[PDB]
């Protein structure tokens, strides 16, 4: 048994090692919006840039996760990764929503880890989420919503000229 | 009695403080209208800072007052702050036009304190505002009817993205 | 409805709200308490310092109690904001009591509206609270307490010579 | 009683008490066992240092607490501090995981401690305890183990060789 | 049909995003590997650190081949990712043997592209190759060779002793 | 037997253990002084920094010594700490009244040692003791002896202001 373990249950264990194949497949989807939007065809750097930046901010999450399951005694333990929900990603305003559900999709798992943290009396899990998974999520949210209703309003306006304009002036 | 004031009248001690209450105003009016262009579904960062610092400015101009009252041996009154006008203040446009009946009530303010200091032989009152208040608030005017006409030429064209236009490239 | 709000409840947002509502009252409290200290009549400076360095702060809290509200996507309200509960605040010792049954009016308010989150299960609003509000009240009320401990000592002496002491030596 | 004290329980504040002393009888059992490898014929420099900064640290938690106690109005209270539970403390690896059971003692109080304070809606503890005591202990206990694995791999190949290059290559 | 594409077969088009497939793998089962080793029951950091940095190339190096596929006018196509062939990893010689089995697989996938490429007379997609993959292939199993030699030489002696001088001296 | 003791007597290693534990205690002592100052309702700052920079200055006493103990191949035993002689230590001159006592009584324990090592014809015991203990001792009670009588001038004066001026302008 492992000699560091100490008031860490295994259903937090095992809810970490769900959360990191989350994040992981997170980080994959963004690889993939990235790269729709460097196609020659498509051609939006600025969008490109947002969501390769996004990939890595995710990959981090998981080794982050991982490394707090190494701190507390558990066992990392890792799944298949499914692949991307789409292989075409439509236009900006059609990728910034799937990025906040996406994003919604992640904040509710933490919300779930830290309520079982605290059904756990799990103190150091309920900190750990708050102090660097917690507020990152919400400001991202936040600055996705800003982003989608600025791109809403200019493609209402006049769809490519908006889309071209969003990337050279916010991204 | 004071053992410094000295041709200060009892009027304009008054409507010094009233001019206080009206600044106070004036301040938190600009909080709202800033935090309301913060909003998710409103995203206008350059308009949400334009108008928080205008509630600083605001802010700066009741404590410089403050100040005055006590150097000329006046008695500071503090009344209730009547809260802004609205709770939604509509697009940029909207906002922006409300910015300048703002600043004209508060510019026929200062005009109708520096009349009655006058009338009341107070040139030191006089030069007080001269100095501080009444070139910045006609300063500020013109830079508001200046960004109004922008606003205008912008929004009648198309308007989701002339909203942006400006507060990309103006603010 | 919000694009971005996520186990945020009605009766934190209202909450929230309210919180603003007491900050900015506690702001112009700190205010008139700062300026009274500044007549010519009471004159002493390290105390108007103090306490408009307080007024700055508890404006910041507001401010960052609005910037929260709208990163939940919770929708900010105004409301009068009540004068200060008195219009001259007497010697030093006064005034020094009168700042610590504000700041444990505002500490209660923060409670309570943290077990108002631990009710509702938000979690990032109650690291929210922990993090900017609750340890800088426990700080500034400790300073408080030291310093009202010192007044005391100082005026059970000699009264005029202590309130000019404390002013020159500790503010 | 005192002007500062707000939802600060009896119960915690017995209990700040009573960790401040296992706090300080943790840093003496450091002290012994740092200058046990200081022995001339013990002589492990690094383990002798690696002891004296724990002795360091758990002093530093002890301030840490009375800090906070009297930062909430409690008042500190000493108790008599036992000696160490031995005289010598063997080889490193004895030594290693006699640290491990301290810690992993002193952070089951931090837990109670916690659980404490979330019974008696005290927010303001359960944040002091989770950003400054308990992820430094789960670092440390992680380290501890990560240093026994590796001493246990060493002197189970030949003790002396063994203990010899930990001490020059890990410590 | 594509703008740009001239030269890029349909085959190698598939056979670059079998590649990616490939190196996402290759990265995931370093991120295994490298967690592995910072268990507190195994605790090797430098082994850790080794997989860890190898994970980091192979996400570089699918990143590497999803640019050049966008460049010559191909479309990204992201499959299922498998998880690692392992959940534990074994002593050190046993994980280096782990590692140059994968390398030696995606060196072999490199030159059966290679050869795909030569057969389709696509010299950009051989100049690719040999620029960015064949030398760091060959360059790195080369080392991982060498210390495959190494470790054994040094477990070969005594097992636990060997590997933490390896740990400690190499990596 | 020690390969390294001589002219090390078993009354004077005994002794020096008992030194340590006299050291540990005033440390205590100290450490409990501090705090007191530091209470809300005593707030005396440069108070509670005297008293806690000799709980540094004593615990660094005792860390001499068991250095020297094995530097002579004796070794160094630990008893039980008594807690300090009172939980609530009075005003400033009741303190330093206190500190006297308590480094008179470290004096003479000093004192006691040196004419031990005398007695047993240990020339290195005595030098020891000499250069870095005696003087310092001596250094100390003539400051502390200074404080006292500055303290008992201005206390006689008016308590409570006198205080407060030592503590401000001396400290």
Same mark, same amino acid.
């Given at each position: ?100 559900? =996406?994003? $919604?999709?992640?904040?509710?798992? &933490?919300?779930?880890?830290?309520? @079982?943290?605290?059904? !756990? #009396? ?17 400001? =991202?949210? $936040?600055?996705?919503?800003?982003? &989608?209703?600025?791109?809403?309003? @200019?493609?209402?306006? !006049? #769809? ?12």
């Amino acid at each position: 048994s492992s000699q560091i373990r100490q008031n860490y249950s295994t259903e937090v264990e095992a809810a970490v090692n769900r959360l990191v194949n989350l994040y992981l497949r997170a980080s994959y989807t963004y690889l993939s919006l990235g790269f729709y939007f460097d196609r020659d065809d498509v051609a939006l750097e600025g969008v490109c840039h947002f969501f390769r930046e996004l990939a890595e901010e995710k990959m981090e999450g998981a080794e982050r996760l991982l490394k707090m399951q190494n701190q507390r005694g558990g066992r990392a333990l890792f799944q298949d990764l499914q692949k991307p929900s789409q292989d075409e990603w439509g236009t900006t305003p059609d990728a910034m929503k799937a990025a906040i559900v =996406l994003e $919604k999709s992640l904040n509710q798992a &933490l919300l779930d880890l830290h309520a @079982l943290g605290s059904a !756990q #009396a799990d103190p150091h899990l309920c900190d750990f989420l708050e102090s660097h998974f917690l507020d990152e999520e919400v400001k =991202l949210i $936040k600055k996705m919503g800003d982003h &989608l209703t600025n791109i809403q309003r @200019l493609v209402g306006s !006049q #769809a490519g000229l908006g889309e071209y304009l969003f990337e050279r002036l916010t991204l």
